[PDB]
Amino acid sequence: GHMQTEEYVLSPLFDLPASKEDLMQQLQVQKAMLESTEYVPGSTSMKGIIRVLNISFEKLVYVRMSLDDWQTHYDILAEYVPNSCDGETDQFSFKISLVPPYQKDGSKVEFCIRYETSVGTFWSNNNGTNYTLVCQKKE
């Protein structure tokens, strides 16, 4: 959680696991959350890694985005990173649509994770500042 790198990174205005403590404290509520966002070098997309808390083998990690008020959602079924789960938490990744190095006007994209498990559907949804990314590079 919290990939800080001096390179092309998206400008986020939401909550991300800053420390393992902060991670755990939020992960008891909203079990499925994003770790960080990374651009794809040479590809018109961005990839994010979502960390979910293994509470159910039958787990679903759906990434839904909207640049809209949420009248629409692409539903991306995230791809589980093989063997990432070490008993407690799993890691999934997904690719998103185009980003800043290709279109940097503040395109917008708010995504949320729908974690459907045997023990409930955990929505990773926040104060509005969900996974709100403003399509612009760091520097």
Which residue type does 129 have? Answer: T
List of residues 6+ apart from 133 with CB closer than 8 A: 10, 11, 12, 37, 46, 108, 109, 110, 111
List of residues 6+ apart from 69 with CB closer than 8 A: none
- How far is it, in rounded angstroms, from Cα 13 to Cα 122? 21
Are 109 and 98 in contact by the 8 Å Cβ rule? The answer is no
- How far is it, in rounded angstroms, from Cα 139 to Cα 89? 33
CA atoms within 13 A on the CB side of 30: 19
Q: Residue 39's domain is classified under what CATH number?
A: 2.60.40.2440
Determine whether 63 is exposed, middle or buried from the number of CB atoms within 10 Å of its CB (0-12, 13-18, 19+).
Answer: buried
End-to-end alpha carbon distance in the chain: 22
Q: How many domains does the chain have?
A: 1
Token pair in block for residue 136 = 């612009």
The residue range of the domain holding 39 is 1-139
Are 57 and 42 in contact by the 8 Å Cβ rule? The answer is no
Within a 10 A sphere around the Cβ of 85, how many other Cβ atoms? 18
- How far is it, in rounded angstroms, from Cα 39 to Cα 115? 24
